[model samples]
Every structure is written in C-alpha cells, then in structure tokens.
Target: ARAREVLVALGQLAAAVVVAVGVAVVSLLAIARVEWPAFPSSNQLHALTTVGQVGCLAGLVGIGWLWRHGRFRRLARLGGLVLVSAFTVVTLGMPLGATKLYLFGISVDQQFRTEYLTRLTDTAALRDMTYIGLPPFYPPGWFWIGGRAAALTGTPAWEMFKPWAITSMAIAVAVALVLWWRMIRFEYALLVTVATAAVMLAYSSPEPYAAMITVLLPPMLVLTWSGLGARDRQGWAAVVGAGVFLGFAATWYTLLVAYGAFTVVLMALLLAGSRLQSGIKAAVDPLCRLAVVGAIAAAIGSTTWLPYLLRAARDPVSDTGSAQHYLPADGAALTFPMLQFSLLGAICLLGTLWLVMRARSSAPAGALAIGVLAVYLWSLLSMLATLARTTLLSFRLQPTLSVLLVAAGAFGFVEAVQALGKRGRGVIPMAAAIGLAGAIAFSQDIPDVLRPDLTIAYTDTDGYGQRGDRRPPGSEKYYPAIDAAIRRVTGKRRDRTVVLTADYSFLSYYPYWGFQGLTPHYANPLAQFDKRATQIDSWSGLSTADEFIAALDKLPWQPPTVFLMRHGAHNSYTLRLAQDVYPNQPNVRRYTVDLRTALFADPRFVVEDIGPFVLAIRKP
Candidate 1:
C-alpha cells in the first residue's frame, strides 16, 4: 500500500512539473499579444525569458525537491527553515552595486526619491530649486523611514536605500512567512515565501514599498476581525497599528483605493443578500470597529498628507506635470494579468471564483482569504477602467497584484488537494501543480539579480540605475572631465551659480547646487500658474542673444544672477525641451544670438573660462 502511494505521488509530481511549464507558456503568449491602454513603462526592463530563463529553471528544480521532501511532516518543517534561511542569506550577496550617476538602490525613480531625501536635510535648497524639482507625489512614510536610516548612517537618503531595501524586503518576507504558514501547509508556505521574492523583483520597480503594504493586508484584516470579537487591549492595539499602517498605505493612492473599494463593495454585497440583516448583526461590531480603525489611521497618517494637500491647492498649476499624461493607456488592462504572469494569473482568478462559489467564509480565515480576493479583483478592474484614467494606472498596482496572485493561487491548489483526498486518490499531483506554478513564477525573475546590466551591457546600458561611468558615448572617458568642469564653475559650491543645461537630467549629477532648468517636464510647475511664486509659463521667453538678449536685458539681474549657456549636449539646448516649450511653434529661439559671441562683443560684460565651461559676467 505504501509503495502504491509513492507511485501515485511520483506520477503527480510529473504532471505538476508539466503544469508549471504549461502555465508559463500560456503566460508568455498572453504577454506577447496583449495591448495596453497606456504603454508599459516597464518596457525598458528585460522580459523574463530574455534574461532569467536559466534562474527560473533552477528555481523549478529546487522547489520540486523541496516539495518531494514535504511528504514527511518533520522534513516539511525542516524544508521551511532551509527555504527562509537561504532567502535571507542569498539576498546579502545580490550584485546590486552602487554607482555615482544614479543614487537610488535599484531604479530611476530613486532620482525623485533622492530629492525628497535631500529635503529632509536641506530644507533651504528645496525652496530655491522649485523649477528643477517638484513636491514628491508619493507619501512621506517611506521618506520618514529613509530619513531615520540617513540620520543613523550620516549619509544621503539615496545612499541608504540599498540597506533600506534589503531590510524592508526581509521584513516583508518574514511577514509572508507568518501569513502563509497560517494559511497553507508548511511546504507550501515555504514555496509561497520564496515566490513572494520572485514577484517583488519581477521587473523594473524592485523596491520593497509594494511588498511593505501588501504584507500588512492579511494581518490587518485578521486583526480587525479579532479585535471586534474580543475587544481586549492587545486586540485593540493590533487593530490600531494595522489601521495606522493601512491609513498611511492609503496615501499611496492606488493601494488605498483598492483596499477601501474592496471593503465597501463587499459590505454592500452582504447588504444586497437576504441574509443581510443577520450578517449585519453578527458583523456590525467588528465591521464598525474596522471602520473606526481605518478612520483613525487616516487621521494619523494625515501628518504627511496635509502639507502636500496644502501645496497642491496653493499652486494648482504648479502641479501640472505629474507626467501621467505622456503615457497613453494600453488595451491590455484586463489582459495584463495573463501577459505578466501567464496562466498563473488566470488560475488564481479562477481559483478565487471557485473558492467563493464554495463559500467557506463561515470560517474566519476563509473570510480574510475572500477579503484578499476582493483586493485582487478591484485592483485588476480599476486598471481596466479607461473612463477613470487619471486615477488608475495599471503598472502602479502590478507588484501588489503579483502578491495577491500568489495567495489566490495557493488557495486554489490547496482546494484541489482536498478534492482529490475525498476521492481517496493520491494528492501528490495537486501539490505538484502548485510546485509547477511556483517554478514558472520563479523562472520569470531569477535573471534580474543574477544577471545585472554590469555583467551584460556593462559599459553603456539603459542608464536607468547604472553608475556615471557606465553611460554610453564614452561617458567613462568624458564624465570625469565634465565633473571637474562643473566643480571649477561653481568652485564646488551650490550657491551663486544657476546651471542651465540642455538636459535637466544633468541636475542629478550635481548634488551640491540648487540649479534651475526648464527641461524637466514633470518639475516644470512654472508652466502652470502657481500663486505662491512668480508666474512665468516658460523660461524660453527670457534669453540673451543680442536682440534676443533684450529679453533678459530688461530685468535688472537679481543679485546679478550669473546667466550661463552652452552649445553641446551637457550645457546647450535640447530639442525635446524645445518641443515641450513651443509644441505649436517651430524652433522657438531661446538664444538667437550666441551668448558666447554676444557676451564676447559686449563692452559691459567680461568673458572668461572658469574651467572648460564659459563664464560671461556683466561687469559690475
């Protein structure tokens, strides 16, 4: 009888492996064919098959071996320990290198985040650099945590993100361990834990922020229900903490809407049912308590949002370039799930429906599981709603969606196992199906950490998060000279000089000075009418080219603000910005007269070289 059982389990494992690959194949096809309402910003990132094929294969094998060992309860527990242990240790060795060009640990979004970090220390600079920077659109929660890290390390917030990301990712994984262990079997829990990492790092935005909020969703729901039941201090405290966390999380906009929308809709559905009266009576205390905690959390979290609210209201126009306008919505909103994770997304979506049809929410854990299902559905649907384009961008919630997929998929797998058990069949095939799904997910992400741009592109890649020396067109050779020239121009000081460059991106290179450029589309709040500051739509009208010089010649230069210009890529004008400033007009000349030659001829000005950069000073 035991031998027969082993044979059944073995047969199940083979089927499971096939299912994993099968899902991956379908996922890839969906991804390739789907149309997006807006172009996916992650297009710049490498697709899973392109980079991580081998790593995923390894993940499949590893998960299978672990699944095989899970037959014994002791071995399953040991496997969980080993899985988490390896995840923790292997993270320490990730080839996430630090370079001078981009300060953020993993992506270009760090460029904006780095400025927010700067605000924590240099309140004065933020004020002076309004044209080059914008108030952070993200909530202050992550910034506050980063600020603490910066304070402890005495480094800029950007520099601290590496350790911060690793720490937060660890916390997220640790929480995944707790949540999955309670929800699924030990072996499955271990699989879920590792899969969490794979999904988090699947593409471009590999930060821990998405995982941070997602890990709380299950725990918060559980605690809310628990608090309602007993009303003890411990329960109360847990509920409040969860509330505050979710409240802060809500400020993320997408997450807040997804969770809040889910809760309200669920409540309404219960009301529509004939059992509404009894459901309300039983759930009212807990549900009310849940609302109170959420309300309290929003109030507490307002400490960060209030200022942002004030700023946006004060200069409604200055907030013009949130930059979402540039992205056209793609048709793949609903199809996005299939393309990104293939059959895994479809299985989970179906599994969730199956679970609901079975309706086990009479059990508390089952209700929370359904609660998460609501989040998944709402988040997916919101992304699809083109009528509400301004509020919903699909990419923003995908990482969170990825987490939900794993949980829902796990639930489905467990249910399948139970169904097979009732038939007195080997349950190994069902477990194997789950293992295959994990393998597909793992395969999708393995290459990212293992094969960084440094190992492949190395020299001149996308410049998303690479070092200064790695940008193309011989950046390694010319960057130092450019760096030294900027130092010479400013005397390595941030004060007195205003840098007007062809590329606003160059501003990221000079962390020392508060320079203003008209190039940053998102930061050009000046393009809109801002009440708190002067209302100049574009800096294009003010140029110094002989007759063109008349534009700047009118205003007595404030504190003799030294006006500088260059003709090349770093210092001159960008055609892109030209189109931005005068989209309707052709080559709206900013400096028709060369400032170099015009100042060269002007008797009132002195022309000299501070370094390779030209210095044109109007004689005092």
Candidate 2:
C-alpha cells in the first residue's frame, strides 16, 4: 500500500508539472496575443518567466497533494500552511519587485486617490466638496473614514490604506475561522482555510480585496447563527450583521448588487432546505422571520446603498457602458487554467448540488450548497445583468468567482472525504482526484502574479535599458530623468500642477512627485472627470482635439498644466476606437484625436526640451 501510494503521488506530481507548464504557456500566449490587452507583446523572456511561475505554483500544489494523500497527512497539512505563509510574505514584499504593489498608481490611483487625498488633507476641499466633479465611484466610508483616519493620524496615503488592507484580510480570515469553529465541520473549515487563504494572499488589489473579506464573512454568519426559526437577538443580529457587513461593499454598487442578489438567493435556498421540522409551520415561520429581519437590517445599515441608489436613480445609464458580455471573451479568455479553473468550479458546484439533492432538505450543508450555487451562478448571472443594464463589468467578476469557488471547492472536498469513510488508507483516492482538479484550477492564475506592472528602474538617462532594482522586466528607468526635467523646467513651481501624458510610460513621474512632499495632480482629460470617460462624465461626447481643449478649459481650475510625452510611447485612444460610446449607434470607426500632439502644435502652449530624456510642454 505504501509503495502504491508513493507511485501514485510521484505520477501525480510529474503529470501536474507537465500540465502546469503547458497551461501556463498556452494561457500566457493567448492572453498576450488574443486576450484583453495584457502586455500585448510576444517576447521570449515573458513566456519563459510565465512558465517558471506556473512551475512553482504546480510544485507547491503537488506537495500539498502528496502530503494530503500520503502517510503524513497531518504533518503535510501543517507543512503546507508553513510553506504558504512563507510564499505569501515573500510575494507581498517582492511580488513584482521595484514595481512593487503600488504600480505607479493606475487610473484608480491617479484620478480617485489624488482627488480624495487632496480633499482629505486640504480643508478647502471639504468646504466646497471638490470631489463632486470627480466621484470615487465607491462608497464614502473608505473616503470619508479612511481619509479621516489618514488625516487625523497624519499617515501617508499609501501607508494607511496598505495597513488596512493587510489587517482587514487577517480579520476577514479570522471571521471565517470563527464561523467554521462554531458551526461548520472541522474538515470543512480546514479545506476552506487552505483554499481561500491561498488565493486571497496570492492576489493583491486592496479595496476589492477588502470586499472579499467583508462579503464572505456575512454568509458564514448567516449560515451559523441565523435560521428559519423565531430565533433571538443573535438571529436578528446575524441578519443585520450580514446587511451592514455587505454595506461595506455597497460603497460600490457592483459589490452591493452582486452580493445583495446572491444573499437573497442564498437565504431563500437556506430557508427552503432547512430541516427544522414542526410540520410546514416550522419552515414557513423561520423563513418569513429571517427575510423580514434581513430586509430591515439591509435597509437601515446600507448607508452606502441609499446614496448609490439616489445617484443611480438620477443618472443610471450614462456612466455605465452598454456592453454585452455573455462569455469570458477578453484577456486570458478561454485559455488553459482559465478553462481548467472554470471546469473545477463547475465540478465543485455540481458535486455540492448532488450532495444537497441526495440528502434532500438537510440543514446546514443544504444551505451551504445553495450558497455555493449562488456563487457559481452569480458569475454567469452577472454577465447577463451587464447585457440588461450597466451592472458589473464581466471581467471583474473573475476575482469574486475565484473566492466563492475556493469555498465551494472546499465544501466539495470535505464531502468527498466524508463519503470515502474513515477507512485505513493512504490519502483517499478521492482526495488525490480532488487535488488534481485543484492543481489545474489554481495553476492558471500564476502568470498574472508574476507579470508585475508597477516596476521602477534606475538606469542611465541616455539609453533606455531594462536595468534597475532586481532588473525585473517591464520596469521603467526614466524616473530620474522625469524628475530632473520637471524640476528644472518648473523651477520649484511644483504647486497646482497637473500632468498629461498620452504615453503610458511617462507616468513614472507620479511616484517621484509623491516622494518629496509633493502630489502633482494628474489631469489627463481621458481619465479626468471620472475613472473612465464613461457617459456619466460630460466630456464623453468630446472626440476632437478642439473639443478636448474646450472641455479642459471648462474645469473651474486649470492649474499649471504640463504635458509630458516619451519619445517612443504610443497613444491608446481606446474611446475613439471603442465600439460603444453613447445610447445609440454611430456605426462608424471613430478615429481618436491626438490631444497631446495637438496641444504641442497649438502656439498657445510653450514647449521646452528640459532634459534629453524628457520633453515638457506647458498646457495651453
């Protein structure tokens, strides 16, 4: 039996490594070539790096698999946790190295944080509410409370937010652990801890990440504390807690809607499947009570939702683009590991469904199964919702799906283990099978983590070479040049500045600006009024260069606008080329106007060659 177990484990590891490499290559190529514009460059080094990352992921999973099914299951599990922790710490510290976690602050960072932080620090913004023009598109809690925290404590913007992100994840996982300890089976908790922790720690997108923490815990509370009975303060508290907890995510409507819709489904399923029997009355009474409580809680506690609802009512369709997404057809779409993960999630859902149906009206597991059902189904339903109205972006749903799938997969895993019985065995064959499926599911996302975009380099200004901190690929070497040029040209006039760069590479100045007690406002009209030039923003109608200038001129304060452009950087006029722009059809491939070049051409602006590596053109 030992020999057989060893053989099986070895075979699985070999197979997993091979499969991981193949899927990684296929997915990376597919994403780069065909998937949504993710580093759309076909370079050999990029491909090799992806392969290596995938290999590492596969090896880790295989080790876990071997430990689970081998003679040292407990030891293996403990060891697995240690290894996972080590990896997570290392990844967070040096995930993309130099690019770091805060990749020069993207659209969200530049537009949202700049305005929000400005308001937080500058008391003048509080009086006028300068952010009214540039909405965060998120609940006011993080802005209002988190901003206040940063202000009152005098913390750096990044530091405060970063600490919360790390701490909140810990708290969120703790909440899950508590739920499992109090109500869920030990085995179920273990599986969940492993699966969710692995994925959660692996990926780092702070706010949405906090959403996962807030969103997942509520359901666990509902599962453990609430039911379809008269219940007590605890039950009411659970319902209310679920509501308010979800209110955290309600800062953004996508989370609120997706989670709200799922909560309703999960509650319905839980009540219908409850085994608390005193004839039909027992079931019906609890169901009615739970719904009422939940509704009341959600209504009262959803402070964020109320404001969002009001705004949505006034102008709903404009900000939200009317794009249809029925399938995963974007970057990394339908690639290996993506398809593999999708299939694994589907398998987990199906397995849970079978278990629930076979048991027929069991208590917790039935409800649990339904929650899983809601999760997997939501991914699909969300795509449909996008077609109906501007609900949630289809691609954004993947992270949420990944979180839910991990939990569902955990439940399925425990169920499989239970079905096999406590017979003396070297890791049940079913466990090994589930491990293989998990390896496939988790292995696909490895490339994304390895491909870091927030990189900075310290290379010479004369020539652009990939040399900097650890010399990671895609790291920019123009920070010093940008710094020197901007400072030299401005002559210490750094206040009230807005940077416009058509080339994405020229964005390196943001970090440098942030570094010496300066936070230069980024005033790219494309990402100006709103995160995207969605219909909600008035400037969405402007396409021509003159129109863009006219729109910028309309802003109450122009500030000292400066245009920075890299020699080789190309403009991505996505809006001009985008298929959908307004309520109706233009049926025309509307060409994007080069506003940056246009500004430089107009005699109204003065262009100065500040540095060999940098060009500074004063905004007209």
Candidate 3:
C-alpha cells in the first residue's frame, strides 16, 4: 500500500510537469501564429485577449459550480485545469506577443540577467556573469535552467529569455495549483491559482525568477504552519516540503529566501506558544521540527552557496556588501495595498480583516497573518538599515505582501459564505458570481498595468537587430558586425577572450569574459568594482602604448585582450562607466574614461572603427 501511494504521488508530479510544459508550448505557438499589433498601438488585440481570458475563467467557474451539484463532475475537474492553464498563458503571453524581449526588454537589470543566462548557456560551470574565474554571487538557479533550455533549443539566450520566462512562470503556477489541490477542492484551488497568477503577471512577472517563488509561497506557508503542529508522518513530510521550497528559494532570489525563513521561524514560534498550555514537552516538538527544516534547507542551499562562502572566507576583504546600497522612495515607505481602489485592493482589505479576526481560531489565518507581519517588519528594518547606508529592499516585497493578503482573502470569502447559514444557499451562487466579476475586472487590466514594461518590449532593439514595432533599429544594430569583427581579429572563443567595453550589451549578446561589470550593484563583490574603476582611470593617463600594454599585463585578474569603445573626436576613444555613489539620492554616478589613439598605436595592437564603435584588439 505504501509503494502504491508513492507511485500515485510520483504520477501526479509527472502529470503536473507535463501539463505545464505542454500548455505553455501550445499557448506560445498559438500567439506566434498570429501577427499581433504593437503595444499601445491598438486596443483591439488587447480587448480580444482580455475577452478570451474572461470567457475561459467564467466557463471554468460555471463548470465548477455545476460539478458541486454532481453533474459532469469529471469534465468539470479536467476543464478547470485547462481553463487555468489557458488563463495563465493568455495573461502573460498575449501582452508580449509582438516582442521577442521579455517584460523589461534588455534594459538595466534585465540586461545583466540575460548576460548571466548567456554565460551559463556557453558553459555549465557556475561562474560570475562578468568577472572571470569567480563563482556566481547572484542566485544562478533560474538562469542555470534557462541556460540548459537555450542550449537544448539552439536559441540564443537573449531570444530564449521571453519564452523561458513565460514557460517557467506557467510551470510554477501549475505546480502551485497541484499543491493547493492537496489542501482544498480542485475548483477552489483553481480559483486561487488564477487570482494569484493575474496579480503576479501585472506586478511581478518582470523578475520571472522571483515571481516563481511568490507563486508557491502562500501554499508553502500553510503547509509549514500545519507541519509545526503535527506529530505524524504527514507532519514530517510537510517539514521536508517547506525545507525544499526554501532551499530552492535560496538559489533563485536571496530576499525571498530571507522572507520565507523569517515567516517559517515566526510560524514555529507561534505554534510553540499555543502548545505551551499542553506542556513544555509539547512546545519542544515544534522547535525540533524547525531544526529539521533548517538543516534540510542548509544542505540543499549549500550546493550553490558553498563555493562562494568558501572563497569569501579565504579572501575576506571583498566588496560584496554594496548589494543593498540603494534606498528607493518605496523602500522608505511601508506598503498598504488594502487602501488602493481596485478589486485586488478590496480583496487585500478583506484578507487583512480576516487574518486579524481569525488569528486565534484558524491555523491558515494565523500562518498568513504572521507572514504579513514578517513583511512589515522587513520593511521597517529596511528603513532602519538606511542609517547604516544600505537597505533591506523592502520595496520588492509589494507583490509578496499583496499575494499573501489575497490568499487570506480567498479563505475569507469562502468562510463568509459558509457563515450565512442554509439561507446562504443563495449566497453561494451570489459569491461565485461576484468572484467571477472581480476576477474579470482585475485580470483584464493586467496589460494596462504593465504598459510601461510592454512599451519597452516594443521600443527596445532586440537580439535580431530589429525593434518589435518595425522601427529602424538603434546603434545596437551594429552589434552583429562588431561581434564578427572582434571574432575575426581575436580568433578566440567567447570564454577565451576578455573584452573591456562600456557597451555591456555586447557581453549579453556573446558570452565573452568582461574586464569590468555594468555596475557595482550587479557585480560580484570579489571583482572589486570600485578598485577596477580606479585602475582604468589610472591607465587613462598613460602616454604610450607600451605603458598601457605593461599596465594591462600587470593586472591580478585576467586582462582584456580586446577593447570595444565608443569612437570619439581628437583621435581618442571613450568608455562610459558607472560608480556607486551611495548615501546619495541616485546612488549610481556615471563617468567616462578617455584613451588617446597614441595609447594603442603599436604593431601589437589592431584598432578599427565599425559604425560608431572603436574596436581595439591585441594580436596574439
């Protein structure tokens, strides 16, 4: 019987993965088959997409209601799965149909993320995105998987980013639905999945890796709370499950891991506090279970972190601490999503009241309430950390907080209908109708909410050297020719060459090692971002090519064999760079380093001009 049960569990897991991948592929294919209008150009495609999403969701709810009455129950169950899958696809993919770029295009942070994926795509070894011979400091889980996908599909990392983002998000949602199904009815689980997906698509999908963690967090909270209070095998299983979630979180995004760990610790304490009346012995069990969870998480997390930790231990003076140096206005203020004037805000309000009212009597409420408390505390702590010249990045917690409240709101809505008594027979259908209306209203507005990001997708030049809206491409159109020129001159593979260039996008397009990073925030601390800037400045003053060559060869790390700089007047080249001027409003300050033509005028150096770029290569 135990073996049979294990087989059933494995089968369900397989089904969830297959369904997710299949649905994502089909949805992407469907979107690609049509030639869609550019974003904000026409609302015709948006309206059609929105209507299609609404029709599928309403149909699912109607089928679920019928299934509750014992009519076509099996079809209702299967149909709920289909509708949920279709809804996730349309919500994310439709708004992005005209563009090959993901939500933010290759702008700013996304550019660095793409570069990481491109680096991993070229080699399976976990190395820093820009710095040579350093283990990755940024969580590599999402990009590692994305790199594998790019390799298998024969797609460039930049081009693969959009589809992979959509597909990974879909997989996370599908898995979350499976988890919810274990705790509640299929129909209710489907409702929660869709609600979470809609909110996430609008607010969090830009950071696809973080969004995956957010999608699974609500269910993980409930499971952790229940596991802390359980003494049975099922309880132990929940503990293990929660640990795996945190371990994965550790590899994907550092902030979410901290948030999840704090939430779990809070849940354990609350459970122990409640059990104190039973005996001191009863309270010990929760703490012991908490230890087990922590141990499991540490073991799994070490796979990615151990190398970096060991390296840091050997070289302790690294500058990795600047990761939290910025304090945006949102980080200064606490979030109150409940006060906003929208259906999502209304749901959050209901969730807030429900959590406060039911904390003592309801396990799920208490668990989620504690999660909310953790978010607020983290936000407050982030504000306080500004005194130390850094932040906890509490601003990014908006989606996490919003989703937790929405999950609690789902429970509140259901429980409210139950309390209406037998006369509530009318209330059940009424509640369903209201929920359907709210879902449509909120889900339909997701594209509009993401207008800025979607506009970027249309306007930004893509890897194909064309803008999604058919506009003439920017200077980035020269990237392919530049890439070929560099390759021809250097006669080296991507990993074999280090290029010093201000155009970081070149590294994003090809997997070359970089002499410097885009910014200190995104750079590995071991790279000594500030010191590198100083070294480049010092080199700028050198008068002769021989001095420049000697300075470059004297570097402690790998030296750049190629330099891609912007062509400048007066027989000089410019490399635009940035520095972290923290404790200021805009923490990052941009500056330029100019090198005269005489600095590279030697038989050992080959300098050529392509478009507006000056390419200088050191002969082997």
Each candidate structure's TM-score, on Cα atoms with residue i matched to residue i, is 0.64, 0.57, 0.96
lDDT per residue, candidate 2, 250-332, as tens digits? 55334545555565656655655674565765556556655665676466546545544544565522333222222334422
Predictions ranked by TM-score, top down? 3, 1, 2
Clashing pairs in 2: 35-331, 36-331, 69-427, 99-454, 99-455, 103-454, 139-251, 228-286, 229-286
The global Cα lDDT (0 to 1) of model 3 is 0.84
**How many residue pairs clash (N, CA or C atoms closer than 3 angstroms) in each of the candidate models, in the order given?**
17, 9, 0
Residue clash pairs of candidate 3: none
Local accuracy by lDDT, each model: 0.45, 0.43, 0.84
Best by TM-score: 3
**Each prediction's RMSD to truth:** 11.3, 12.1, 1.8
TM-score for candidate 1: 0.64
**TM-score of predicted structure 2:** 0.57
Indicate the worst ten consecutive residues by lDDT in candidate 2.
Answer: 512-521
lDDT tens readout by residue for model 1, 313-379: 7664544334332322331343335334455576557545554665455333454555655655764
